[PDB]
Amino acid sequence: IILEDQNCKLAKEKKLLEDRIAEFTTNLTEEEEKSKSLAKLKNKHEAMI
Amino acid sequence: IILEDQNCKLAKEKKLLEDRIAEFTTNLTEEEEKSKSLAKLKNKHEAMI
Amino acid sequence: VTKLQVELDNVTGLLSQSDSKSSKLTKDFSALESQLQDTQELLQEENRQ
Amino acid sequence: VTKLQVELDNVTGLLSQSDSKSSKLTKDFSALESQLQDTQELLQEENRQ
Structure with a gap:
């Protein structure tokens, strides 16, 4: 009986964690490209300079 | 044991997701720090270029 | 000049x-924000259950 | 030189x-810490109830 309440609680938490991970992981893709793209942008000014 | 086995494997998901969500969120912000840090440093090259 | x-x-x-210091706070901000979402959203399920 | x-x-x-902006971010980081701890305690205490 105690495991049912604990298992049910972990089930809802696991479902919400995976759903929230996609909301943050999706932004990491855009930030990863923007962060990496900005890195080469600084090198462009150095090469142009 | 069968119920504990499912809860045992399911508990790792809630713990892994909770532990991965902290790293995933920090990973997304890591690009912002590098992008912002590189953007600030790149601004110096822009003013110099 | 030189x-x-x-x-x-x-x-x-x-x-x-x-x-980096300001961006470092944002790193934990996204982690805590994502954790609060899993906890705040779970709070609604707690009252429902 | 100018x-x-x-x-x-x-x-x-x-x-x-x-x-200076990092100081303002401390409120969000500190607020989430107090909110996460309160939300975590509420979620944990909800399981006991």
Whole structure:
């Protein structure tokens, strides 16, 4: 009986964690490209300079 | 044991997701720090270029 | 001019350090924000259950 | 020299704004810590009830 309440609680938490991970992981893709793209942008000014 | 086995494997998901969500969120912000840090440093090259 | 150029690199380093400190807080902000979402959203399920 | 001095003021202002902006981010990081602990305690205590 105690495991049912604990298992049910972990089930809802696991479902919400995976759903929230996609909301943050999706932004990491855009930030990863923007962060990496900005890195080469600084090198462009150095090469142009 | 069968119920504990499912809860045992399911508990790792809630713990892994909770532990991965902290790293995933920090990973997304890591690009912002590098992008912002590189953007600030790149601004110096822009003013110099 | 030559001294200010080298001095500008040192001054620019402080901007990255200050930005890293400010961006570092945002790293934990997204982690805590994502954790609060899993907890705040779970709070609604707690009352429902 | 004058251009580098102007950039130094902007660089000093950027680092100062970043450090000052980091102080405001501490409220969000500190608020989430108190909210996460309160939400975590509420979720944990909800299981006991």
